[PDB]
Design an enzyme around this catalytic site. Structure first.
Site, PDB file in Angstrom:
ATOM      1  CB  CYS A 268      -0.869  -0.044   1.267  1.00 50.71           C
ATOM      2  SG  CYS A 268       0.114  -0.273   2.743  1.00 50.71           S
TER       3      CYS A 268
ATOM      4  CB  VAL B 174      -4.182 -21.644  16.846  1.00 47.32           C
ATOM      5  CG1 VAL B 174      -5.034 -23.007  17.472  1.00 47.32           C
ATOM      6  CG2 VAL B 174      -4.402 -20.616  17.750  1.00 47.32           C
TER       7      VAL B 174
ATOM      8  CE  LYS C 228     -26.279  28.965  -1.418  1.00 46.40           C
ATOM      9  NZ  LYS C 228     -25.220  29.889  -0.620  1.00 46.40           N
TER      10      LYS C 228
ATOM     11  CB  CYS D 119     -32.511  40.312   3.919  1.00 48.05           C
ATOM     12  SG  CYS D 119     -32.558  40.871   2.457  1.00 48.05           S
TER      13      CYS D 119
ATOM     14  CE  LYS E  86     -26.992  29.112   9.300  1.00 49.55           C
ATOM     15  NZ  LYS E  86     -26.463  28.243   8.275  1.00 49.55           N
TER      16      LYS E  86
END
Ligand code: SF4
Ligand code: SF4
Lengths: 1016, 1016
Positions: free
Chosen positions: B135, B222, B573, B670, B708
């Site tokens: 890798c 094992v 949005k 705004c 908001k």
């Protein structure tokens, strides 16, 4: 149509976009074996074949950095106290300081610090074996990510300064030449134009000596840096660069003159009036063996003293007037020895066309003395290594070497080495290069040094402290003394000798020197730049000062700050005795604003600290003491009272009476009712600010500034209230109201007492720089000319200049000192000088401050601008890389006949072609670019464009456009190369996330543009 | 009084090593520099011909091991690439991007889950993978100067954390209950050999649902070669045990002592006993031998790697055997023959047995060595010797012991053919000889037991390389035995590959089909069953994470893909009525400068000058209908904006309601009026305007809606209260902070619009504004308890998400972390949050901080030796002090040898949750009780700093921070560079905040009398 679903074309462009997987992946081991090679970046352990390097002299250093990589590594450095890397540097470079300068983008100040203690600083950055020097002591070795690449950082800063084309100047602390005492016109001779003599002559010139001559045997200068160190480790124009800096000081160089019995001797130097001599001729002859006597280069035999200069002469343009060919080294090559010269012989032999290189040494691998830097280059170029072999005989047939016979060595009981006569190796070879070291053997050169005493190593004997030979007027240093093994040690030998030569010459003219040795620093015209500024009737020697905060906890700390160079300082905020406070603890914590990165460069702090716990009597006595001892340094007393006219008038008058140049009013005290949800701090209500200022204005006659909180709807309101109240300026800004977060069990940090309580605190540092920068600009546009003292994330000359450009006149610092110490002031000052000076240089207009324009690079190395490599979809991995290396190699071969070296470049410095700006000339120049949103053009749209040659194929531009943009980027499944398509909106997210500086650029859109409206 | 602003003598001397600005160049002779370098040396010394002693020292020597501090830093560095080539180059195809992403976010459970999903031996592999050939060999960051990512070490760290967590693996939770599985899944399945290949195969078969899986192992132990030969100092045995017990959680049975062999287990006996499928994973059980060694015994000093390495393993791995094995006494000179990777393990293991010297002797050259450079580097750093071009011929024996081996020289020709020169002999003295010539399958009884499957030219079972099926359709094979795999990870992958096709075969035998695309299950634990749903404002969220109204929600097709990825909710949005249509400028989104010039991943902030959506209300309203139709359980919230106009807000809010929006979000950005009556320009900055807008929307719609808020207000609580009075159902806290992100050196801004290079104030987002958003959320939740909060501002992980939940928020909006990455971070956030809640129920882990174990004393992430003579002795890790530590450590290892006791490796049993797992409603707001006024903070419970000398890396940053930002309370020793906090500490906590080692400094209760420093 379904508006919330992508059409086929967009679904196709998103093919490589990450998705959450719901199953483990099935891929066979065989399928994975074949696919591994497509993506491979690093060397393949299964490849035994050297890649063709014939006539390839490109930089092979693993430590070379470009600006992106240098900035990263410089920020990684811990910038340690009493740093062990500096202790392990033979020239004692202040590595902490120059690396700090790099992390601050102040590359001039880094170079100046480097060349101050090492006039061959770019050479040493390139060639120092740092693992056996500075890097070997680096504290970051004790981290998994390992030690700092000190050499590459030194190389980077020094390369930028070289590109600046700024000359060294005469030590500006010296008297005019005219007024110099007669001892400084003593005739001084140095022998040999290598590192040792260049250092010595430079420091002698720094001290003010005006008649210094280096006599050089050869017709080239620089010593082994020029004649033997390979071009692919040290480019010759580095050497030329450092010679011209020394020549700026007035040192003369006369080529073609030798120390030798029939030419220059100590006797002749004495007959011609020279008052002191420095011997730096190095070790000019090869150590030879009887086994090789009578063998010619044409039979195939070279010493390192024959081979390496031939290669350097052919590959180093401007070394010689003669253009010369590359030696014809074809076939199998045996290099004898395991020193560092042997490895340069092995790698250089590959550049001459050798098919196979064997390094054969008489001891084992555990006995190789070569630094691993050097060993790795030969190993990665597939040289072969043979240990435990001693040469016995060279086989010559038909007039050329065909083989070397060896005997095996081994180590016994003692550890003494034996030779095994019965155990032989017959090794085929067409070329033999002995790298047995070097000596001084020539009787005629030795006799010219009569009568100085030689030691049993057959080299001149010196006092190790003074570098003085047995003749008090003759000194020596470098390889010829036999202690120095490296360029930097030889530089240090000349440096050490310079002080004692100076001592000797002064004493011959009847004058003494200080018992404390003091060599001057390195200087350029940048250091003469004026960075003073005038604000609110006050004169600041530089615009940087300490904010009212933890670095000014004690007036003894302000004292040391002024001794280090800070232009001004604020007292910590103090109050009347009635308002005494007691801090809590813990109370200052690191910011979490850039993730779990610990140590240097914290992006913020949070504090819940109150006003000073020290009394007003202490601070007032302290201000008087400070102003007595530092009349030119500005002291501002920061004070706080509650909403009470008598207290504000009492406390300000007390501070005025003590000698403060000015006061700063800390508006953080809480008031009465709260009333109209308009905060609880005095500084949040313009009516209280205006009243407080009126009170102080009545009480005192010195200037005073109101320190404004950013925690308000409109800071321009409280700024104008302050002005309306009589204030002479405002300080913008205090800290931002914040909380630095919680541990996973919910408990805060800081957590106070057993109840683990906290309160809201103030955020400082570079995470609030956008906020303070907006505040300064907004006050500067609303109240033109009203003085602003800027505060908030200032941590460099460059960030300071942003605040000056925005309307501030002076620059307060807190968190940057918390992240470091008071000495950052020297970085800030030289950085600001360099930024102003560079504004005067036409040739550098394309630069951004001290940053060159970024050009096409990989790993900070310039991309070859070949025709066949470009436009051709060859990323730097897998089989595409193989094809790139094949293209480069064939061009190097074409470059062996298409052979030019006769257009060098006289190196002449850039002269300022416009006046150098003062601080008053730059204050507020950015404001012309600031406006409303309606003043920005929406006709002039941009798009992104990607330089494929700088891309490192990560796909972040693609993922960002896919999940935060317009799906405008194609990412190739085979080459992992992105291409911006015409649907680009120019939003500029992709450029913002790319890890390669300037790989993506915004350019003017040339196709028609249409906003995406979803539906008509 | 004295002089208040000067340091007293005692302070002056504490400040002795404090950095000071330099006026001159430093004189230090080269000899003095040579004699001082040794004091500070951190790294190997090129002059050291001498291995330190390692007899009986089985500590971790891996270069790649990481502690948390190092892991976070390297994970943060990874580019987290699209279509990552590191994953392409991993034979088990791990999602390296995802798991390293999780590590950077502190979600170690998610990283481990991602690792073990595709690799059931994930810890073993992170430790032992030759990543340079796998890798890491494909890592894009190889094309930077700082180089490729330490992938193996990151995989080790996350898996090691998950191991300590003691969470069991659970049966695949998508399966039906065992009782109603089809009969096919009860088919008896046999696997032969309990190594990586069979452990992986059985694991994946058990995941698919098979209930009768038996591994038959020849030995009594094992784990295969992971147990019997890979040394303890590279792979501790409890790693193997941990992975085995994870298997056994799934019900796989293991039976030891029974072999695939004639007269034992054969394919015939398997068939006759009703087994339906078999996987052969018995590896290569026998040594490759050389006729020259016939007759030699261990008594004489001869071993193969198959004799030697299990002997060292048996003695050094507690829990392999019942036999406490004595370490083979290997005194004198050891010859190891070969240069594959087994040879190097024999070399390093020989030193642990007391070898005085080790010679690796191989028959080709260095360029022909096949071992990965990581494996070679370990032997070279431990001072083994290497001898190339030697082929052994005779072993000389005298006095019953080997005394020497003699060889002949080897050679290549033109043809590339290897010859031996009889006349060129080496007689090497040696006491021990270990052949590492490789391994083979040669027992005739074992091959016979495989009848009648077909074997190939290498005498190995032939398989179809895609299905791993032998010529018998019910018999599959994988690992070393098939001759393809060269590594643990490829063996694991062989079993993984085989398990899909065993499944296909078995299901077909019972008359059932399987899907044509392979669907192996992921890896699951009880953490995955944790409920992270939450109810807020009458709405049910399937998890608390959503997309904020921002660039990631530019298009509804993007939201659709986010819901497909797992996101709980999303905002459109912001959109508006047609008359309010806007047109964006460009550039308009740029990177933050809030944490310096670090480029690429993890940007600490962005700045934007973006407007509302350029897409129409009709597009958005239609899109919300389609998203709610297709994703009824995902919350869609319409974000909308009008001017201060009642009809407009009522029209647009009703339009969005009619489209099917779950709720609305009112963007209060705004402008209205001119704006600085103390309440600015945007509607969101004036409470009266907010109350009125919310009243308008409340009259118009019956679905919930949230206002908001902007953080750009004096008192954000008054705005939240106004919204609440107007009828809002909650608040979103907060929008972006207004700022200016910086200027270039010429004064122009960025973003710069047009030829005029103009700009306007933008909004800052991301982790740099988290303290602001966190404070706002906290102050609202305390002022208006129970009023719902949607938090936004720098949320980038489950950990930071929980900080906001703890602080009173119910759900969590993300923008910048997606812009820094892609939508799939949602899977990291969900598993991270599950793990944080799960761990709160675990009594045993109560000392951890979330998923972070308590920091134990370490260097480079390896626990320091708790040895008495090592502790408190003032022995920093450099110079002569390091050499003493090495002597003390080796003496202790030797005392641990001559008493050969202690073999109690704890049996492994999972931690049980003791209380119910907290739901999200459990944690919300639970940290708010720790907040208070300053007056509720105790000033009687002070703290002091205390430094752990064993973790320190001697940088002195604590010292310089206390010196120039504190109380000059730290002594920095000039010889050891160790700091000590003194009783003048005030607990300010700056030193802890700047220290680079996590928790090296701790704040503890002050036990001495405390007087504030009043200076007077
Ligand atoms: S500028 Fe924006 S739209 Fe264009 S490619 Fe970059 S991210 Fe995509
Ligand atoms: S800052 Fe931390 S690592 Fe550095 S000297 Fe202080 S305690 Fe040690």
């Amino acid at each position: 149509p379904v508006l919330s679903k992508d059409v086929a074309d967009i679904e196709s462009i998103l093919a490589l976009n990450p998705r959450t997987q719901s199953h483990a992946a099935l891929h066979s081991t065989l399928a994975k074996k074949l696919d591994k090679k497509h993506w491979k970046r690093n060397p393949d352990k299964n490849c035994f074949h050297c890649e063709k390097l014939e006539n390839n002299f490109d930089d092979i250093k693993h430590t070379t950095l470009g600006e992106r990589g240098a900035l990263r590594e410089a920020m990684r450095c811990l910038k340690c106290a009493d740093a062990p890397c500096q202790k392990s540097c033979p020239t004692h470079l202040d590595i902490k300081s120059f690396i700090t300068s790099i992390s601050n983008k102040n590359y001039y100040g880094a170079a100046k610090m480097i060349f101050s203690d090492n006039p061959l600083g770019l050479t040493c950055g390139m060639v120092c074996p740092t693992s056996d020097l500075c890097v070997g002591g680096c504290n970051l070795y004790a981290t998994e990510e390992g030690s700092i690449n000190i050499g590459g950082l030194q190389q980077f800063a020094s390369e930028v300064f070289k590109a600046m084309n700024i000359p060294q100047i005469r030590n500006p602390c010296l008297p005019s030449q005219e007024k110099m005492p007669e001892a400084y016109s003593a005739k001084i001779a140095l022998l040999g134009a290598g590192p040792a003599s260049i250092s010595c002559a430079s420091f002698l010139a720094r001290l003010g000596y005006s008649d210094i001559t280096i006599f050089e045997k050869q017709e080239y200068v620089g010593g082994l840096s020029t004649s033997e160190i390979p071009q692919f480790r040290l480019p010759y124009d580095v050497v030329n660069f450092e010679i011209e800096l020394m020549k700026d000081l007035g040192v003369k160089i006369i080529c073609g003159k030798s120390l030798s019995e029939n030419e220059i001797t100590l006797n002749t130097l004495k007959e011609e009036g020279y008052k002191a001599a420095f011997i730096g001729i190095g070790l000019p002859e090869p150590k030879t063996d009887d086994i090789f006597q009578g063998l010619t280069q044409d039979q195939g035999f070279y010493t390192s003293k024959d081979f390496l200069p031939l290669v350097a002469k052919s590959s180093k343009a401007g070394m010689c007037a003669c253009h010369s060919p590359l030696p014809s080294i074809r076939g199998a090559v045996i290099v004898l020895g395991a020193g560092d010269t042997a490895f340069d012989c092995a790698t250089s032999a590959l550049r001459c066309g050798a098919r196979r290189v064997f390094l054969v040494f008489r001891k084992g691998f555990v006995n190789i003395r070569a630094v691993p830097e050097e060993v790795e280059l030969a190993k990665e170029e597939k040289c072969e290594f043979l240990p435990f072999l001693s040469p016995r005989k060279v086989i010559v047939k038909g007039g050329r070497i065909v083989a070397v016979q060896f005997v095996r060595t081994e180590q016994d009981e003692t550890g003494k080495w034996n030779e095994d006569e019965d155990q032989i190796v017959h090794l085929k070879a067409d070329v033999v290069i002995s790298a047995f070291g070097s000596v001084l053997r020539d009787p005629k050169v030795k006799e010219a040094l009569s009568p100085i005493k030689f030691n049993r190593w057959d080299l001149p004997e010196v006092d190790p402290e003074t570098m003085q030979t047995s003749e008090p007027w003759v000194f020596a240093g470098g390889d010829i003394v036999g202690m120095a093994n490296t360029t930097v040690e030889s530089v240090n030998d000349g440096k050490q000798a310079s002080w004692y030569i100076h001592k000797y010459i002064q004493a011959q003219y009847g004058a003494s020197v200080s018992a404390k040795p003091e060599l001057p620093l390195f200087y350029t015209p940048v250091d003469l730049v004026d960075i003073s500024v005038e604000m609110a009737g006050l004169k600041f020697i530089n615009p940087f000062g300490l904010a009212s905060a933890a670095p000014t906890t004690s007036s003894s700390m302000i004292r040391r700050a002024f001794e280090a160079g800070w232009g001004f300082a604020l007292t910590k905020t103090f109050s009347l005795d009635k308002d005494i406070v007691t801090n809590v603890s813990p109370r200052i914590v690191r910011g979490t604003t850039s993730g779990p990165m610990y140590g240097p460069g914290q992006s913020s702090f949070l504090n819940i600290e109150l006003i000073s716990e020290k009394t007003a009597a202490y601070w007032c006595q302290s201000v008087t003491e400070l102003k007595a001892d530092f009349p030119d340094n500005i002291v501002i007393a920061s004070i706080m009272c509650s909403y009470n006219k008598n207290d504000w008038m009492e406390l300000s008058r007390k501070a005025e009476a003590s000698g403060a140049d000015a006061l700063e009013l800390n508006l953080s005290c809480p008031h009465g009712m709260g009333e109209r949800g308009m905060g609880l701090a005095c500084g949040q209500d313009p009516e209280l600010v205006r009243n407080i200022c009126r009170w102080v204005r009545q009480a005192v006659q010195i200037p005073f500034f109101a320190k404004l909180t950013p925690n308000v709807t409109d800071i321009v309101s409280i700024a104008r209230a302050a002005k309306e109240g009589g204030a002479d300026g405002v300080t913008a800004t205090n800290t931002v109201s914040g909380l630095m977060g919680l541990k996973a069990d919910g408990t805060p940090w800081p957590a106070v007492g057993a109840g683990k309580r906290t309160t809201y605190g103030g955020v400082s540092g570079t995470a609030i720089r956008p906020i303070a920068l907006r505040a300064v600009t907004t006050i500067a546009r609303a109240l033109p000319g009203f003085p602003i003292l800027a505060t908030g994330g200032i941590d460099s000359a460059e960030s300071g200049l942003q605040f000056l450009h925005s309307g501030a006149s002076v620059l307060q610092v807190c968190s940057a000192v918390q992240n470091q110490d008071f000495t950052v002031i020297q970085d800030y000052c030289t950085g600001l000088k360099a930024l102003l000076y560079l504004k005067s240089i036409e040739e550098l207009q394309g630069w951004d401050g001290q940053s060159p324009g970024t050009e096409s690079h990989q790993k900070g190395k310039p991309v070859p601008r070949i025709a066949e490599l470009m436009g051709k979809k060859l990323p730097n991995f897998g089989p595409y890389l193989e094809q790139r290396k094949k293209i480069i190699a064939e061009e190097k071969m074409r470059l062996k006949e298409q052979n030019a070296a006769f257009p060098p470049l006289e190196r002449k410095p850039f002269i300022p072609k416009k006046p150098i700006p003062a601080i008053k000339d730059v204050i507020g120049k950015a404001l012309q670019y600031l406006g409303t949103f309606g003043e920005l053009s929406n006709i002039e749209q941009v798009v992104a464009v990607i330089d494929e040659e700088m891309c490192i194929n990560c796909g972040k531009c693609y993922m960002t456009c896919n999940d935060s943009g317009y799906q405008a980027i194609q990412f190739d499944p085979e080459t992992h190369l992105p291409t911006v398509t015409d649907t680009c909106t120019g939003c500029t997210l992709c450029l913002s996330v790319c890890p390669i500086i300037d790989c993506i650029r915004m350019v003017s859109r040339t196709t028609p543009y249409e906003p995406k409206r979803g539906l008509p």
